[PDB]
Design a protein around this ligand. Structure first.
Ligand SMILES: *[C@@H]1O[C@H](CO)[C@@H](O[C@@H]2O[C@H](CO)[C@@H](O[C@@H]3O[C@H](CO[C@H]4O[C@H](CO)[C@@H](O)[C@H](O[C@H]5O[C@H](CO)[C@@H](O)[C@H](O)[C@@H]5O[C@H]5O[C@H](CO)[C@@H](O)[C@H](O)[C@@H]5O)[C@@H]4O)[C@@H](O)[C@H](O[C@H]4O[C@H](CO)[C@@H](O)[C@H](O)[C@@H]4O[C@H]4O[C@H](CO)[C@@H](O)[C@H](O)[C@@H]4O)[C@@H]3O)[C@H](O)[C@H]2NC(C)=O)[C@H](O)[C@H]1NC(C)=O
Ligand code: XJQ
Ligand code: CA
Ligand code: CA
Ligand code: CL
Ligand code: NA
Ligand code: NA
Ligand code: ZN
Length: 805
């Protein structure tokens, strides 16, 4: 109930919202149907429109008008945005040359440059270039400020997940808004774009920027707007708030536009009808900037122009139907469209089996346009699993396609020509970032970056301490002229042991054999030097990784590779080696095919054993440093040490062997040498974070050898590829992957073919940031480089995407 007979007189767009059943006058009252009776009359004036004209100049103030051209309007803070242009001979902001803003030029009483966030729904990254002729105000922001060629959204590339990620710095799995529609089984409640359930605070986790500001004594209302308030009135409201007295004035403001998304859905991303919405958004930016210029704030405010996601061509005819795959289609609930989420229609149905649904959806049709996954098997880069609102069964839908339950869903809802939601690495889903103001750099282009990083920067822009989030604070320091955040490297928690030769061969009873009993004072001292670290500067290029948790581990040196060997997990946490452009690939000699050799630096009690693998009929083993890349026949014996062995399903070993035998050498030829760090990952509870020992769900049968959920590799070389990886003077270049360690290759529909036709495609799908590997392993990489730490942070957040131009 609302007692709507209160009044908005003197309260229009009040910042504090009032409590039921008292009527409301804030920018959200329309959404709640709770505005006072006189809200439209008082607060949503439209008389005479949005622009001054010659005849209005110096008019007698008329309180009915939408905005004013009377002489008093500047002191009132309520002139039409074009007032000074029409009436006082001034120029539009867009017509002024840009001049570097070296320092904030702010009116007295301003304690800090305000931040204005201008969010545009569905603003695809390529609009910046393709629409530049019809967006002169945005083009000036972009060219004079700091811009990225594009910004990567989070998955799913839907509105609510992305806007709330912008506000919180968190992945959707952590903030809880994991789609535009959701079912929460604990609440037993549903969330929708339409309706009131979304108003309940229990859906919305983390700490959004307006709450972070408020808690720290910086004024800020929410970033939400009722859809029916026109854009011109939103801008005028922001400009009025900026005229408040110092003690009442917010320091952060948000404008939201439903366009160009609204039209993009109807017309496709590049439909001829799309020009007008782009012109209209530009006009709104022009209004704001002209309004700031009138207030003398245009060289004081930091403005962020940012999108939530892009838009792709999608039509009704490109829909796959689950009813073409499944017999039991009525026993499932599907969340449909550009991603699929499946759960049982009834929790009382005990004949429901996820295993049978997945199999019925796996590689069934030659050109199938979606792939089913258990959520824990989704690429780790999506960070889309650790939330009860994310259904166990997920369908990744190909760009340009929809998935639906049955045909009648699609014609009893062709309307639409655009949609979004797909994998956040898809080119059409990328969106925009431009920062303009005293705190941003001048005419500066920065590399693409992820939207999860912006919360930290917005906090820096406002002098706030960010709540805990998924950005990597410092990785965007290069966007900023000042207010950089100067982080320190995390402290190593566990220091390594450096074992010498401590065990005789006969102390081992591992059930392994090797044909290595074939026997030189010259070369004898040499191999001792190698075991003591003599080649470590070659294979460990950026220092040893730091272990950021409590554990017991050993550093093991070898001619061709160095490793950090876990006495708790019985295998390396990491193995580092460098492969020059000139390296040669060789085979595993016949006599060494089943060779595993005890490591006399490491006790039998802390070693794997071969008998466990003999007995485990499902499980085989592979090596972290590949024997194929040994520097010499004698160095090759080091590759067969029991301390370089890791458990691998035979189906995985097809993937791993091709990576090690073919692809490492290919990258080293292409990149002029590579340094590789490889290792296991254990993430049995799919939270994106390193498992403790007591969280391991699977062991090699009969043993304490834990089975990894994934294997990673970090592949580093010189950004200037005229320099070899091992003698690089400048910035680095990296690509990484986190490959799922799976007992079948059902994910790769072409897996019956030669690895040359499917393995690299799998690895591209499972591309990762070094930071993702850091979270999953508790390791900290690149501790010793010649580079600034902020630059290293940017490198650790890099994702190699394998998308074209
Ligand atoms: C991305 O960044 C984020 C933010 O930094 C990272 O997420 C953090 O990860 C931490 C570790 O997983 C986690 O720390 C836990 O906090 C628990 C207290 O939780 C509440 O308070 C915080 C702080 O205000 C709040 O943010 C939480 O909000 C979550 O939950 C509500 C719903 O209740 C949601 O509205 C909200 O969206 C959010 O949900 C997400 O997180 C939860 C987990 O907290 C998930 O379950 C959801 O799926 C969703 O993703 C909470 O309201 C604290 O209780 C935990 O302590 C337990 O574990 C420790 C280990 O130190 C153990 O020693 C303790 O004994 C304790 O265990 C006890 O409870 C167990 C479970 O019942 C039981 O089994 C035991 O036997 C014990 O009794 C824990 O320290 C932190 O909450 C989140 N923060 C956020 C905002 O998500 C995230 O990891 C980053 N991602 C990556 C990939 O890096
Ligand atoms: O504004 C809109 C449409 N719209 C319109 N009216 C609404 C009315 C009420 C609410 N509630 C949400 C939960 N709220 C608690 C907050 C405070 C702490 O936790 C979240 C209470 C207010 C929402 C809306 C709403 O969304 N779309 C753009 C947009 C802009 C910014 C973001 Cl971050 C997002 Cl996700 C979307
Ligand atoms: Ca959107
Ligand atoms: Ca984990
Ligand atoms: Cl109303
Ligand atoms: Na076996
Ligand atoms: Na297959
Ligand atoms: Zn949309």
């Amino acid at each position: 109930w609302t007692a709507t007979s209160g009044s908005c007189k003197g309260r229009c767009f009040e910042l504090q919202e009032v409590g039921p059943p008292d009527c409301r006058c804030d920018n959200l009252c329309k959404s709640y149907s709770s505005c006072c009776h006189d809200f439209d009359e008082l607060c949503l004036k439209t008389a005479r429109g949005w622009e001054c004209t010659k005849d209005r100049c110096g008019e007698v103030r008329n309180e009915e008008n939408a905005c004013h051209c009377s002489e008093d309007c500047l002191s009132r803070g309520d002139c039409c945005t074009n007032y000074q242009v029409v009436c006082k001979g001034e120029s539009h902001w867009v017509d002024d040359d840009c001049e570097e803003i070296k320092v904030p030029e702010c009116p007295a009483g301003f304690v800090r440059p305000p931040l204005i966030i201008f969010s545009v729904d569905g603003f695809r990254a390529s609009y910046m270039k393709k629409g530049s002729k019809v967006m002169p105000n945005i083009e000036k922001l972009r060219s004079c400020g700091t811009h990225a060629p594009y910004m990567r959204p989070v998955y799913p590339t839907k509105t609510f997940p992305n806007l709330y990620t912008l506000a919180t710095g968190l992945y959707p799995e952590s903030h809880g808004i994991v789609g535009n529609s959701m079912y929460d089984p604990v609440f037993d409640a549903s969330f929708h774009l339409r309706g009131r359930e979304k108003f309940n605070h229990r859906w919305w986790g983390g700490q959004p920027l307006w709450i972070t500001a408020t808690k720290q004594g910086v004024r800020a209302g929410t970033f939400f707007w009722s859809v029916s308030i026109p854009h011109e009135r939103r801008i005028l409201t922001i400009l009025q708030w900026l005229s408040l007295p110092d003690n009442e004035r917010p320091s952060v403001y948000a404008f939201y536009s439903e366009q160009p998304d609204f039209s993009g859905h109807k017309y496709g991303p590049f439909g001829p009808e799309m020009t007008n919405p782009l012109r209209e958004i530009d006009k709104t930016v022009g209004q704001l900037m002209d309004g700031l210029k009138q207030l003398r704030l245009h060289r004081c405010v930091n403005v962020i122009f940012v999108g939530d996601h892009g838009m792709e061509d999608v039509t009704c005819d490109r829909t796959e139907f689950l009813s073409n795959y499944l017999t039991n289609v009525d026993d499932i609930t599907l969340v449909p469209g550009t991603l699929g989420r499946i759960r049982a229609k009834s929790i009382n149905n005990s004949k429901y089996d996820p295993k049978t649904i997945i199999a019925a959806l796996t590689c069934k049709k030659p050109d199938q346009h979606f792939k089913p996954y258990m959520k824990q098997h989704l690429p780790k880069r999506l960070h889309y699993a650790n939330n009860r609102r994310i259904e166990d069964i997920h369908l990744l839908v190909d760009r340009r396609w929809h998935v639906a339950r049955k045909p009648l869903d699609v014609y009893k809802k062709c309307f639409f020509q655009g949609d979004h939601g797909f994998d956040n690495k898809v080119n059409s889903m990328q969106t925009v970032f431009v920062g303009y103001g005293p705190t941003f750099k001048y005419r500066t282009k920065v590399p693409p970056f992820e939207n999860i990083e912006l919360y930290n920067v917005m906090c820096d822009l406002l002098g706030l301490k960010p709540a805990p989030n998924n950005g990597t604070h410092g990785s965007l320091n290069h966007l900023l002229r000042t207010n950089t955040f100067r982080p320190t490297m995390p402290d190593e928690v566990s220091r390594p042991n450096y074992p010498g030769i401590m065990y005789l061969q006969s102390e081992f009873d591992l059930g392994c054999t090797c044909d290595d009993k074939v026997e030189n004072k010259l070369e004898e001292l040499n191999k001792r030097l190698h075991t003591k670290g003599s080649t470590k500067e070659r294979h460990l290029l950026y220092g040893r990784p730091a272990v950021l948790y409590r554990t017991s581990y050993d550093i093991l040196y070898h001619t061709d590779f160095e490793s950090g060997y876990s006495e708790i997990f019985l295998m390396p946490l990491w193995t580092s080696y460098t492969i020059s452009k000139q390296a040669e690939v060789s085979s595993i000699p016949e006599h060494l095919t089943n060779c595993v050799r005890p490591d006399v630096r490491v006790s039998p009690g802390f070693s794997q054993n071969c008998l466990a693998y003999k007995n485990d009929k499902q499980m085989s083993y592979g090596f972290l440093f590949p024997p194929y890349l040994s520097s010499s026949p004698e160095a090759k014996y080091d590759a067969f040490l029991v301390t370089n062995m890791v458990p691998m399903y035979p189906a995985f070993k097809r993937v791993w062997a091709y990576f090690q035998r073919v692809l490492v050498k290919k990258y080293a030829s292409e990149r002029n040498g590579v340094n590789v760090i490889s290792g296991p990952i254990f993430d049995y509870n799919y939270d994106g974070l390193r498992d403790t020992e007591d969280e391991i769900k699977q062991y090699v049968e009969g043993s304490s050898i834990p089975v990894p959920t994934h294997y990673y590799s970090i592949i580093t070389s010189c950004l200037d590829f005229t320099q070899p990886a091992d003698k690089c003077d400048g910035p680095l270049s990296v690509s990484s992957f986190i490959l799922p360690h799976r007992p079948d290759n059902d994910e790769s529909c072409n897996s019956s073919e030669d690895e040359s036709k499917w393995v690299e495609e799998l690895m591209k799908m499972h591309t990762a940031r070094v930071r993702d590997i850091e979270h999953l392993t508790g390791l900290d990489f690149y501790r010793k480089t010649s580079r600034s730490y902020s630059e290293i942070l940017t490198l650790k957040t890099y994702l190699h995407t394998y998308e074209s131009e």
